[PDB]
């Protein structure tokens, strides 16, 4: 957040979950980052740079996260036509 | 009557059988004198109890495995059951066929072998 | 799948799926399990798609790879069928098994001596191991498990459908799970027969 | 009955956004709802929206994001005279800095920030933030 | 005579990374929304700006066949004047032990606040970003933003918390039974929490999802550490 100078304030800028577009607080212990491993996709062997996600507790606790994690990987890979 | 054994007996009885399994007999008097040497029990009457329960446990340990304490040879036979069972080496009998509506899935996923057909009657409980 | 046919399901594995009856799934359904099913028979039994099973296997396994420590991907199962299977899993691949009764408080205590902080979980059957799932949402653990048609989804991030009512469906699936993580991380890769088989991930099954 | 159409409309998109959705169905499609959502789209609280056509009155479908917190209606429709304005916007907005009271004027439907630059009072409809 | 402390050997993973000093601020922790399970982590980062303000020391007591039995339940506030506050309750047989139990618990539950401006900028935020609420069982508060130099206009109870928060200007109003102050202060604390859980147009730009400290610093923790 900006000021007169454009100087940035706020002690931490919180992170905003992928499929809910809302922000998770300092205490919120049902919110998970989930690391998918990429592969080279020529031999199907692990190669470094991961795809990382974040999900909030609200969609987790109702049981909607399973669709969100699927759709996120469906707009990328690995998922073709499921 | 009464005289149900306390936890102080049952705690140390298990321990003494685990670490001195070999020394045990199945006679009262021999199992007493062993407990006297491998440990000190500060009373005499207490000693006569802990021996008798150590004896009574050792009867059952020569059958199937006790669920309160472990010995070595049971963990041997555990491992022997849990690394191969004589029932199969084949997966599962190598060829198993399935009935239609499973065949339709396989048709649309490029598979077309090793099937049977039976079109079993309607319906649930009927 | 992703890569064109060097990750896609082979003709071989199809036989194993059908021989272990994984395709079959129970009578009762949930509204989160509607898409995974294709259809019903003429009888009460609903036929899970095996293509849809296969895609979910991969990113599930790829997440088990993505951690840089294999000693803190804690697997859990408490059903008798799922005891022998998980024990070989976490013996072969570096992982931590928690076999039998969970003994609650082991993801939130500072006094218990079985206290652990893992990152992932891999659970068999939500409705036998509901306890670790509830405690996972107090300390930010990602979660994976094996769902059936009638198993509800709640405090799980990804499902891996299966028949799993106590069958060869169980042990086969845990074997396949351990096969994939080695194709990416390990040197077992070649994708042509591995020495270890699914004939010892199956149930103890009381002998003669 | 359905005395006021716009008032029944906003509660759906309010309820839907809370549960976590991104497509809705709102009926029965008034022209008043269209120009409302047009202004609400420019600022960026919702995405593009598709008007289905029927002879009856139509139906509208919306694509939305979590940026919206709540859009409400204010009924019945009171007048504003550009000195009453400051009193309204204090009660109805979380802050001076952002939030947008909407209204209709003879110069068309618009936010309050625009009306002040045209010197036009008029009848207030709702709000959002 | 004899010298040297040795205090705080971590049994917690997060605690060990702080003790080896590869986590450089609490602001990293909050960004991943981790629990904090030890009271020395916070007291390592801070500890020379944290004050305590014991609100009430309240008796409660039940009835048994031998008569009364009374335990003392005290509330204790905590906060430095830069944006971090907390609050805690605890009860025990005696007084001092309950107080010291609460001074530990309040450090554990500490959180940051988000401060903002009135309608214009001149640097250094002095008030609350947006108009928020917070309820605890029929008590609620309506923290309303205020211009500079008005001071905190509130009852005595929330005037403690908001002043420690560094929120120097605020208008408030209460609703319901504020006599039972345990509700009243927990409802204030509830409101003060919501400040970073309220979405504003500033935060609409998308996050970069930087990798976790748990992931990057895992190399030191492959010895026997848990």
From Swiss-Prot, chain A:
Classification via Pfam families:
Ribosomal_S21e
Glycyl lysine isopeptide (Lys-Gly) (interchain with G-Cter in SUMO2) crosslink site(s): 41
Q: At which residues is N-acetylmethionine found?
A: 1
How is this protein annotated for GO cellular component? cytosolic ribosome; ribonucleoprotein complex; rough endoplasmic reticulum
Cite the GO molecular-function annotations of the record.
structural constituent of ribosome
Q: Which GO terms describe its biological process?
A: translation
Subcellular localization is given as: Cytoplasm, Cytosol; Cytoplasm; Rough endoplasmic reticulum
What InterPro entries does the record point to?
Ribosomal_eS21, Ribosomal_eS21_CS, Ribosomal_eS21_sf
Main localization of the protein described in the UniProt heading: cytoplasm
Query: Which keywords appear in this protein's UniProt record, sorted alphabetically?
Result: Acetylation, Cytoplasm, Endoplasmic reticulum, Isopeptide bond, Ribonucleoprotein, Ribosomal protein, Ubl conjugation
Gene3D superfamilies, per the entry: 3.30.1230.20
Q: Hey, which family's this protein in?
A: Belongs to the eukaryotic ribosomal protein eS21 family.
* Record text on subunit structure and interactions: Component of the 40S small ribosomal subunit.
Q: What role does this protein play?
A: Component of the small ribosomal subunit. The ribosome is a large ribonucleoprotein complex responsible for the synthesis of proteins in the cell.
Q: What is this protein called?
A: Small ribosomal subunit protein eS21
Taxonomic lineage: Eukaryota, Metazoa, Chordata, Craniata, Vertebrata
From Swiss-Prot, chain B:
Q: Which NCBIfam families match?
A: PRK01151.1
Pfam families referenced in this protein's UniProt entry, alphabetically? Ribosomal_S17e
Q: Spell out the protein name for this chain.
A: Small ribosomal subunit protein eS17
Q: Which GO terms describe its molecular function?
A: structural constituent of ribosome
For the cross-link Glycyl lysine isopeptide (Lys-Gly) (interchain with G-Cter in SUMO1), list the residue numbers.
103
Phosphoserine sites (modified residues): 113
- Changes after translation: Ubiquitinated at Lys-103 by RNF14 and RNF25 in response to ribosome collisions (ribosome stalling).
Q: Where does this chain mainly localize?
A: cytoplasm
Q: Which GO terms describe its biological process?
A: translation
**Subunit relationships:** Component of the small ribosomal subunit. Part of the small subunit (SSU) processome, composed of more than 70 proteins and the RNA chaperone small nucleolar RNA (snoRNA) U3.
- Annotated family: Belongs to the eukaryotic ribosomal protein eS17 family.
Q: Which organism is it from?
A: Oryctolagus cuniculus (Rabbit)
**Residue numbers bearing the N6-succinyllysine modification:** 19
Glycyl lysine isopeptide (Lys-Gly) (interchain with G-Cter in SUMO2) cross-link: located at 103
Role of this protein: Component of the small ribosomal subunit. The ribosome is a large ribonucleoprotein complex responsible for the synthesis of proteins in the cell. Part of the small subunit (SSU) processome, first precursor of the small eukaryotic ribosomal subunit. During the assembly of the SSU processome in the nucleolus, many ribosome biogenesis factors, an RNA chaperone and ribosomal proteins associate with the nascent pre-rRNA and work in concert to generate RNA folding, modifications, rearrangements and cleavage as well as targeted degradation of pre-ribosomal RNA by the RNA exosome.
Q: Which GO terms describe its cellular component?
A: cytosolic ribosome; nucleolus; ribonucleoprotein complex
Where it sits in the cell: the answer is: Cytoplasm; Nucleus, Nucleolus
InterPro entries tied to this protein: Ribosomal_eS17, Ribosomal_eS17_CS, Ribosomal_eS17_sf
From Swiss-Prot, chain C:
The alphabetized list of GO BP terms reads: ribosomal small subunit assembly; translation
What S-S linkages are listed for this chain? none
Q: Where is this region: Interaction with PPP1R16B?
A: 53-112
Q: Which residues carry this modification: Phosphothreonine?
A: 96
For region Laminin-binding, the annotated ranges are 160-179
**Chain positions found as N6-acetyllysine:** 51, 88
- Give Gene Ontology CC terms: cytosolic small ribosomal subunit; nucleus; plasma membrane
> Keywords for this entry?
Acetylation, Cell membrane, Cytoplasm, Host cell receptor for virus entry, Host-virus interaction, Isopeptide bond, Membrane, Nucleus, Phosphoprotein, Receptor, Repeat, Ribonucleoprotein, Ribosomal protein, Ubl conjugation
Coiled coil, from the record? none
Span of the secretion signal? none
Site entry (Cleavage), positions: 114-115, 132-133
Phosphoserine: residues bearing it: 42
Q: Which domain of life is it from?
A: Eukaryota
Localized where?
A: Cell membrane; Cytoplasm; Nucleus
Q: Which residues carry this modification: N-acetylserine?
A: 1
Q: Where is this cross-link: Glycyl lysine isopeptide (Lys-Gly) (interchain with G-Cter in SUMO2)?
A: 88
> Post-translational modification, briefly?
Acylated. Acylation may be a prerequisite for conversion of the monomeric 37 kDa laminin receptor precursor (37LRP) to the mature dimeric 67 kDa laminin receptor (67LR), and may provide a mechanism for membrane association. Cleaved by stromelysin-3 (ST3) at the cell surface. Cleavage by stromelysin-3 may be a mechanism to alter cell-extracellular matrix interactions.
Q: Name one GO molecular function term.
A: laminin receptor activity
| Something else known | This protein appears to have acquired a second function as a laminin receptor specifically in the vertebrate lineage.
The entry sums up its family as follows:
Belongs to the universal ribosomal protein uS2 family.
By what name is this protein known?
Answer: Small ribosomal subunit protein uS2
Instruction: Give the species.
Output: Oryctolagus cuniculus (Rabbit)
Q: Which residues of the full protein are shown?
A: 2 to 209 of 295
Curated annotation (Swiss-Prot), chain D:
Q: Which branch of life, at top level?
A: Eukaryota
- Cell location: Cytoplasm; Nucleus, Nucleolus
Keyword terms: Cytoplasm, Nucleus, Ribonucleoprotein, Ribosomal protein
Using the record's annotations, give every residue carrying the modification N6-succinyllysine.
87
Q: Does the keyword Cytoplasm apply?
A: yes
Q: Does the keyword Ribosomal protein apply?
A: yes
Q: Name one GO cellular component term.
A: ribonucleoprotein complex
- What are the BP-aspect GO terms? translation
Q: What GO annotations for molecular function exist for this entry?
A: structural constituent of ribosome
Role:
Component of the small ribosomal subunit. Part of the small subunit (SSU) processome, first precursor of the small eukaryotic ribosomal subunit. During the assembly of the SSU processome in the nucleolus, many ribosome biogenesis factors, an RNA chaperone and ribosomal proteins associate with the nascent pre-rRNA and work in concert to generate RNA folding, modifications, rearrangements and cleavage as well as targeted degradation of pre-ribosomal RNA by the RNA exosome. Required for proper erythropoiesis.
**What HAMAP family does the annotation carry?**
Ribosomal_uS8_A (MF_01302_A)
Return the similarity comment.
Belongs to the universal ribosomal protein uS8 family.
Q: How does it assemble?
A: Component of the 40S ribosomal subunit. Part of the small subunit (SSU) processome, composed of more than 70 proteins and the RNA chaperone small nucleolar RNA (snoRNA) U3.
Its recorded name reads Small ribosomal subunit protein uS8
Species the sequence originates in: Oryctolagus cuniculus
* Gene expressing this chain: RPS15A
């Amino acid at each position: 957040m900006q000021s007169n100078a454009g100087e940035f304030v706020d002690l931490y800028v919180p992170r905003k979950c992928s499929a809910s577009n809302r922000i998770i607080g300092a205490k919120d212990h049902a919110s998970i980052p989930m690391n998918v491993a990429e592969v080279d996709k020529v031999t199907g062997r692990f190669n470094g740079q991961s795809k990382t996600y974040a999900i909030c507790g609200a969609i987790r606790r109702m049981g909607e996260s399973d669709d969100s994690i699927l759709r996120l990987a469906k707009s990328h890979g690995i998922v073709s036509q499921n | 009557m009464g005289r149900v054994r306390t936890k102080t007996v049952k705690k140390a009885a298990r321990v003494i059988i685990e670490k001195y399994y070999t020394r045990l007999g199945n006679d009262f008097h021999t199992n007493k004198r062993v407990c006297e040497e491998i440990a000190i029990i500060p009373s005499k009457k207490l000693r006569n109890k802990i021996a008798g329960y150590v004896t009574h446990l050792m009867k059952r340990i020569q059958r199937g495995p006790v669920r309160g304490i472990s010995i070595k040879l049971q963990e041997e036979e555990r491992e022997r059951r849990d690394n191969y069972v004589p029932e199969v080496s084949a997966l599962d009998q190598e060829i198993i066929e399935v009935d239609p509506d499973t065949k339709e899935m396989l048709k649309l996923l490029d598979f077309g072998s090793l099937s049977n057909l039976q079109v079993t009657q309607p319906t649930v409980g009927m | 799948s992703g890569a064109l046919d060097v990750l896609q399901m082979k003709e071989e594995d199809v036989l194993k799926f059908l021989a272990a009856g994984t395709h079959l799934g129970g009578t009762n359904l949930d509204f989160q399990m509607e898409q995974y099913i294709y259809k019903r028979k003429s009888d009460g039994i609903y036929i899970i798609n095996l293509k849809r099973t296969w895609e979910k296997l991969l990113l599930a396994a790829r997440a088990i790879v993505a951690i840089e420590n294999p000693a803190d991907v804690s697997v859990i199962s408490s059903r008798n069928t799922g005891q022998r299977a998980v024990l070989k899993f976490a013996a072969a691949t570096g992982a931590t098994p928690i076999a039998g009764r969970f003994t609650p408080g082991t993801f939130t205590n500072q006094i218990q001596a079985a206290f652990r902080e893992p990152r992932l979980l891999v659970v068999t059957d939500p409705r036998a191991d509901h306890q670790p799932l509830t405690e996972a949402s107090y300390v930010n653990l990602p979660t994976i498990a094996l769902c059936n048609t009638d198993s509800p989804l709640r405090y799980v991030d990804i499902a891996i459908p299966c028949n799993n009512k106590g069958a060869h469906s169980v042990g086969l699936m845990w074997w396949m799970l351990a096969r994939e993580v080695l194709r990416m991380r390990g040197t077992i890769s070649r994708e042509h027969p591995w020495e270890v088989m699914p004939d010892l991930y199956f149930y103890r099954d009381p002998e003669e | 009955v359905r005395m006021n159409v716009l008032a029944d409309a906003l509660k759906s998109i309010n309820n839907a956004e809370k549960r976590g959705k991104r497509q809705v169905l709102i009926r029965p499609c008034s022209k008043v709802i269209v120009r409302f959502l047009t202004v609400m789209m420019k600022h960026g609280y919702i995405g593009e929206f598709e008007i289905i056509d029927d002879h009856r009155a139509g139906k509208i479908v919306v694509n939305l994001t979590g940026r919206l917190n709540k859009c409400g209606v204010i009924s019945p429709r009171f007048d504003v005279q550009l000195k009453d304005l400051e009193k309204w916007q204090n009660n109805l907005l979380p802050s001076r800095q952002f939030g947008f009271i909407v209204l209709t004027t003879s110069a068309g439907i618009m936010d309050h920030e625009e009306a002040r630059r045209k010197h036009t009072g008029g009848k207030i409809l709702g709000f959002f933030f | 005579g004899k010298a040297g402390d040795k205090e705080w050997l971590p049994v917690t993973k997060l605690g060990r990374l702080v003790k080896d000093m590869k986590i450089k601020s609490l602001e990293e922790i909050y960004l991943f929304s981790l629990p904090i399970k030890e009271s020395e982590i916070i007291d390592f980062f801070l500890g020379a700006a944290l004050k305590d303000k014991v609100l009430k020391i309240m008796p409660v007591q039940k009835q048994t066949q031998a008569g009364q039995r009374t335990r003392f339940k005290a509330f204790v506030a905590i906060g430095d004047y830069n944006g971090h506050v907390g609050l805690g309750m605890k009860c025990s047989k005696e007084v001092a032990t309950a107080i010291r139990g609460a001074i530990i618990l309040a450090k554990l539950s500490i959180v940051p606040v988000r401060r903002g401006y009135w309608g214009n900028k001149i640097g250094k935020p002095h008030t609350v970003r947006c108009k928020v609420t917070g309820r605890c069982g029929s008590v609620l508060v309506r923290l309303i933003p205020a211009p500079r130099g008005t001071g905190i206009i509130s009852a005595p109870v929330p005037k403690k918390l908001l002043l420690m928060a560094g929120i120097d200007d605020c208008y408030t109003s209460a609703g319901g039974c504020t006599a039972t102050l345990g509700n009243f202060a927990k409802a204030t604390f509830d409101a003060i929490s919501k400040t970073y859980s309220y979405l504003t147009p500033d935060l609409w730009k998308e996050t970069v999802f930087t990798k976790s400290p748990y992931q990057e610093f895992t190399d030191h923790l492959v010895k026997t550490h848990t």
